[PDB]
Amino acid sequence: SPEDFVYQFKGMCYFTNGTERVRLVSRSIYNREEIVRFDSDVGEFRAVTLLGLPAAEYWNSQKDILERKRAAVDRVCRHNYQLELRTTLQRRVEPTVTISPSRTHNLLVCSVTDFYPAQIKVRWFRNDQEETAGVVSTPLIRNGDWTFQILVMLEMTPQRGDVYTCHVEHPSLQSPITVEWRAQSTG
């Protein structure tokens, strides 16, 4: 195979509780080894590995560079977060909730598709009583197009008349979404 030499530079911001806690971590990476890091909590460049020691010492010796990096948490992260508040953080895409039976009838699949943001709570109910045993969920699935999906399976032995409800809570919903699957025969 051809040989490849990879360099990555990541200027990353971390936000918690709005902008109560804002943290900047700048990362210099050779192939997959992070070698130099600027963590705004630390306030100077730190060599993660020996490969990054000359750069860390060189940049740290430059007053003008250091002061620029120390102010970058407020200048970059806080400026861009205000842009996020008007755009990404306002994105609300309501989930599409769908029930379909399966077999391994003995399995209900609640498909919760195309929602944003990621925060979501999906519950199964059998005759208004929440089911906890026999519930198997996929991980949160990132579609890559600024939507998520997730599948929540319920192992079931249905009696005729049973109503199975998929209960979905999402920040885009003023009230939860409920979809029902009603057993027409006894399994």
């Epitope: 806690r21 963590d39 909590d41 630390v42 306030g43 100077e44 730190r46 060599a47 993660v48 590995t49 020996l50 020691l53 860390a56 010492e57």
Partner: T-cell receptor, first 107, second 112 residues
Framework: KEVEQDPGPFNVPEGATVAFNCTYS??????FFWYRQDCRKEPKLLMS???SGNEDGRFTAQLNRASQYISLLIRDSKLSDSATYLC?????????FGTGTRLLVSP | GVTQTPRYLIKTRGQQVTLSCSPI?????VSWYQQTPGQGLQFLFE???????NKGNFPGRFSGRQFSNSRSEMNVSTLELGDSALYLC????????????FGEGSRLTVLE
Amino acid sequence: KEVEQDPGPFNVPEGATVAFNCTYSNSASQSFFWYRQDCRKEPKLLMSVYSSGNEDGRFTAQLNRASQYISLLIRDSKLSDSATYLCVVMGFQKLVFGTGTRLLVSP
Amino acid sequence: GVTQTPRYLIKTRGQQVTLSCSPISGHRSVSWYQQTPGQGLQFLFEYFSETQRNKGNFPGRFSGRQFSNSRSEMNVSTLELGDSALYLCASSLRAESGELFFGEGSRLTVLE
């Protein structure tokens, strides 16, 4: 093993020059300091250590990354210099205090 | 500079203790160290922005805390005879600094 200083106590006559030596194992170590600690009291930052040779009064600290040696020089030692001198080495997410070399200046 | 209380304390084995450290005004990082004869300075933990940033190898009965004014507390829930030591706190402006400003310590003697 990470930070190794001169072991035994230094018994030095007043007026003599004293040389403290310290070695560190991790080549990635970034910053180096000398601390001073009087008996049963707290450590106090004495000076930062540079390759060029930091000189502050009677004190000289120097770093040699090739041999991975740190040195502290005390010219014209005074009775008040009597203390334990700690070699302190900083690497990524680890700050290591040496066990210290005790100095006793006699009149 | 750095203010530690209590400065001296006698406890018995099995008792609990809480030590307090007020860092230099404006400093945000508080570290705790244990000073015993023959072992030197041992790192307990460092607190920054009210959360524990780094931790040493001490048992779980050693715990700490940092408040919103950067004052920090250190606690031992069940003291052993071997916990007798000078407990030192050090403050620095920023996290993970090699330039530390130490208080005068809390001298804790644990007796049977």
